[PDB]
Amino acid sequence: TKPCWYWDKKDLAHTPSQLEGLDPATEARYRREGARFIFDVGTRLGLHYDTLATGIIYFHRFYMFHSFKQFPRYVTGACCLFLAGKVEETPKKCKDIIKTARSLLNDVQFGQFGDDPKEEVMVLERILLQTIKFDLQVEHPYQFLLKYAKQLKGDKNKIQKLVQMAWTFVNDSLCTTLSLQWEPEIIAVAVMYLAGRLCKFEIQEWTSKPMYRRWWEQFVQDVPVDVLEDICHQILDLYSQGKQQMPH
Amino acid sequence: TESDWGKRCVDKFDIIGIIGEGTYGQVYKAKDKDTGELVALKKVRLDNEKEGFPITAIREIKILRQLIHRSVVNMKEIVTDKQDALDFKKDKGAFYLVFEYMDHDLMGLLESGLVHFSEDHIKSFMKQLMEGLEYCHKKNFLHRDIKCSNILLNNSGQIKLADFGLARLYNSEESRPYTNKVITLWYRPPELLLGEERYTPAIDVWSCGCILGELFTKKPIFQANLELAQLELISRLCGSPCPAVWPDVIRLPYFNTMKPKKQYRRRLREEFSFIPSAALDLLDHMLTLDPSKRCTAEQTLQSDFLKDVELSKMAPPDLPHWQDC
Amino acid sequence: MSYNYVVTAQKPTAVNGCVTGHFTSAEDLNLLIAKNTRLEIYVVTAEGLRPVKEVGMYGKIAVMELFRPKGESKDLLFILTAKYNACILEYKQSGESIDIITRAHGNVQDRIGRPSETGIIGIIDPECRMIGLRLYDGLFKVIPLDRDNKELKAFNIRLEELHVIDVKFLYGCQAPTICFVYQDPQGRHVKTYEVSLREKEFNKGPWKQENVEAEASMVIAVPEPFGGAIIIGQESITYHNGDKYLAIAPPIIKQSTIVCHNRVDPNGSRYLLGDMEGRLFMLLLEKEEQMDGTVTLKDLRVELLGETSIAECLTYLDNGVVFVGSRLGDSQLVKLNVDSNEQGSYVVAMETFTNLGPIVDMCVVDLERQGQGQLVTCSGAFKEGSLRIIRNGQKLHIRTVPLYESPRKICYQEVSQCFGVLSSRIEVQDTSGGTTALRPSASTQALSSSVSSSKLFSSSTAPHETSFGEEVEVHNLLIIDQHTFEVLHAHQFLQNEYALSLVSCKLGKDPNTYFIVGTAMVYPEEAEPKQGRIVVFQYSDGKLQTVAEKEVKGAVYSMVEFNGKLLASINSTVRLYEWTTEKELRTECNHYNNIMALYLKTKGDFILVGDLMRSVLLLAYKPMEGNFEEIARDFNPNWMSAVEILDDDNFLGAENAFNLFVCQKDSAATTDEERQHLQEVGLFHLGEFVNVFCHGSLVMQNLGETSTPTQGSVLFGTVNGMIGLVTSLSESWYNLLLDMQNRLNKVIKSVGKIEHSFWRSFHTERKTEPATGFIDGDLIESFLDISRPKMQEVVANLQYDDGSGMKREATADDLIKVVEELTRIH
Ligand SMILES: CC[C@H](CO)Nc1nc(NCc2ccccc2)c2ncn(C(C)C)c2n1
């Protein structure tokens, strides 16, 4: 019926990129750069956040079946965003994506697109569709962050602070392989959990079951804290590695 | 696995012939070599390279893998031409969308004039169509192109909805601009003639009602070549758009521009006096000018005309015999 | 685009309706006979009919009735066409000049309505206050006959009874009253209403509803002396009038369905009834007068008079003369005698009017080696079944071969100096357990005879029960000599085996010439036949010998010889068979993308397949591969009645809606899609139902015949006996003739003021389109019959294109020569 789009962290040691001699740090850097390229290009084009995320998910999935050494990331990213636009009904012309990609990339980077940028991108569309197995519909943590937040009742300002901080954590997790490890529903909870810890809020009280300490369970069944912590650990690592700090 | 689409080759199908020409590619009837099942294969050509893969096909792939219903066609898989070995840039082969094969199309059955529909047949037909439409509308998807050609029927009496190349998601909270005219002029709702552009799911209801009347008269209810002429024909039967029946008609861009000859009174019940009472009420509600006052799919399903229809008895339509030959 | 020309070689001959009245003069007795699109006016004499006038109408005549409103000296004529064109007509004569006046006219079609099962019904009030029309289920349309209603404006009255069988205006009522039989789930009923022109609605009718026979078919409005109505069924005849009820159920009428009625005595004492076996009856109203002075109806009696042709309309004229209007056989004048002849019959035939009947199939054959070609047609049905040999010589000479059984398909086998004809006759389950034929016929009067012994389907184990009296078809292959037209041999096919297709040909390396018949096993329980036989027969030395048989899993609807191979269509499948050196058929290749492959035609390695609803398909046999390829299909859905190949690119088809179309290869090789799309480039409303397209011409060819502008020759036969011809034109000749039509239409006055452009518009119930690619030759050939002032008016400002002279003005004498050459193609 439908494909399995989730892997175990241990499995990322065996992506095509890894086996061709790329080390874990480099593939991680390559993923962040490609995701951020997709994010930055589409933000410049005025694209909806779902469109940006869908492209990023295609991108991450793509390099579970292919190597970064044989497929230039920025071409792939541009192709993903191009397709994502058509899937999410926020379409863009390929020439405009190239134009923006040229604006944001230096000369070395734009060399990946080769002599004919549009062609390298449009040609890749075939591989992308076959690679993602024509499973185009994608759900993103954003919708669940809002579906769940709507059921919280309490201080309007404390909840809005929780949401925005968590929303920032969603945007940042797009630079990671979490999109490949955990369903979006879990991600939405994890970022609520993280923001709750950081803002010293006790979300249990805002729920319809103030006494159910495990508030995540009334939204997402069968999630141990083990998972929410692993996700939190992975999100905060990006901030510790980078100069950037937690939004608060 | 069954879920890894886009890799299996079209070699696995013996092509029987061309059933019809689709807008984004032609559709051919074929037999699966392994199972013997008959499937209809839609041709998707990206060789044009104007904008790559057709968005119309993208909509059908995105939506039909989400929609599961007896009255909604099932896309079985996506298969490809023998791809060029290790040279994707040279490769310009096309993709095929596999669908269940359907024996006949409604437009073809009406046009031959051979088919005869009893009340009970229509009940079985309308109940399936509305059940499919309700499923889709509940999933917040709009068909946007309900035509007799897009209604497919098996000789068993099973009905399925087909072309989704123009389908788009509807957001009730957020009104956003769409394509101004989607449904074919003969079955287009008045709001699209007047260019609402922020249309509601009620657009599909209007068409389905046009079909309801068509099953009884064996003739399309409103057929015209110009948008105003259709508005006049609709206006003669359903009444002229006016503020009393359509409070917000004044906000529609073309209300002042497009006017019927007269302010015609509604005559639907009179002109369809031959239609049974249970059905006539269904038509009056489906063919209501104001989209806000037009009945919903669920309301059409919770009907004296359709509620007590049992899908176990699908009433197979009248089959032409050798004597009919 | 494509350019073609269509002309009538023989006008419609079947009688569709007939009425009597005082139409030409308040003094004369007139007989008006209606053939499809044609009206014939006669005057009744003591010897027979005197023809006075014939007009064509741009429409199929659906309603024809004569009435005389107060203030008129003579009867007026109401006609409604099948496309709902209504008009009131008047005869006017000025010395030698006879013309037809259109007094009122209009189109009465409703935007929304369901066409009724029993067809258009039109009746007129005895006081001529209104015309009643039953066009749509659940609606009654009233045209009030006031002096001012020159446009025939009308209103609908809601009718609760949706399924009406028949309706008539009654006599002797205080208000206009309708009496009708209707059907609902509880059976059939007779009911009455009163029509109020003031209120524009029905009021309660004079007498109560009565439950009537399940197969009550016709309503007879009895005149003033009795009043009320008579209802004719399959088993009984009843009289209803308020409290009075009578029913006679004589066993004689149960035998054959009664289809037509007419009034002999104006007072209603005597009525004439006819049935599908041709039997003619007299229905008698036995009066009883009370001392009150009132006249009541005592009893009904039915008396058998004799045999006429199977009749669509009966009309009594005068004295003992009755006109028998026949659609399935030749029409007649017969005299009714008071004394029976020595055989017991009171009916003696006077004159016989040729009706080509239904033309089921036909072939063109040069019997006398004359380079001309004669047309042998399968004509008629049942007792009227006939072979008609037609040659040109200025009238068409027609010879009739009586068969007394239904002819189905015909093919000529020159090697045997004879024709092969498929026929079917009706037998009835008799007390022996077998069947008995109603009358002897060709298949039983053959010199030598044979019955198939094939055991292909003998395993049976499928039960088919028989009830005494049920009808069955018995199918035969007839061998008929080409000079004497004597039935030389008849081969009776298997029980419940229908013969559907027939070819005469050589196959493969076999020097013998065979008759090959494709059959189907027809059981009432089957929706589609699932068994069939392809039988190969050799006619040799007065005996037919079965050479081989092939079992198929369906009906062999159509067969055609294909370059030494046998191309046969079995249900969905189109199959090509090879004839082996062992004298057996072998499947070679198959094509399956058809719902029902009804018709097949070949040119070279190309095949044209005609489907019940999938229009037409162009196949190609690919010899290098040994299989079929789909070249192009016509996607527009049409119901097919006959197809033909005009040339390698143009294909002709006939619709069940009386329409013709021409498809062409789109000839643009840009994309695969364009080629595989057959583009309809010709649309034309013929007005006839075409059964058979046949290449050939009846015109004498001495080799000296001027090469006409027209190229090619396709003859076609129709259900109403009409024979037509289709031919192609050059782009220039078409544009010229088309521009002339538009000029002629402005000049020529139409009966009923019916626009010619509307009449020829393609018309399915669901879609209507303007004609294209076709020249109505019958309009062009009328240029020679319009007066000189009109001829010159037509040619004004008329220019030729792309000729010896690019622009060349036309004169009235130039066009007279052109049309006169166009009349030479038939
Ligand atoms: C006839 C127009 C219709 C429009 O989708 N095409 C069609 N028509 C179908 N019906 C069968 C048919 C065959 C030939 C002519 C018309 C209809 C059909 N069955 C499966 N499919 C797939 C592609 C969803 C079918 N698609």
Residue numbers in the entry:
A (entry chain C): 20 to 267
B (entry chain B): 715 to 1039
C (entry chain A): 1 to 393, 708 to 1140
Published text:
Recently, several unexpectedly diverse compounds were reported to deplete cyclin K by linking CDK12–cyclin K to the DDB1–CUL4–RBX1 E3 ligase. Here, to investigate how chemically dissimilar small molecules trigger cyclin K degradation, we evaluated 91 candidate degraders in structural, biophysical and cellular studies and reveal all compounds acquire glue activity via simultaneous CDK12 binding and engagement of DDB1 interfacial residues, in particular Arg928. Crystallographic dissection of 28 ternary complexes demonstrated that despite considerable diversity of the molecular glues, the overall complex architecture is highly similar. The low-affinity DDB1–CDK12 interaction primes the complex, while the ligand, through filling the kinase pocket and bridging over to DDB1, drives robust association, offering a rationale for the unusually broad chemical diversity observed.
First, we explored the CR8 SAR through the gradual simplification of its gluing moiety. While a phenyl ring on a propyl chain (DS11 (3)) supported robust complex formation (EC50 = 57 ± 3 nM), shortening the chain by two alkyl carbons yielded roscovitine, which gave much poorer recruitment (EC50 = 703 ± 144 nM).
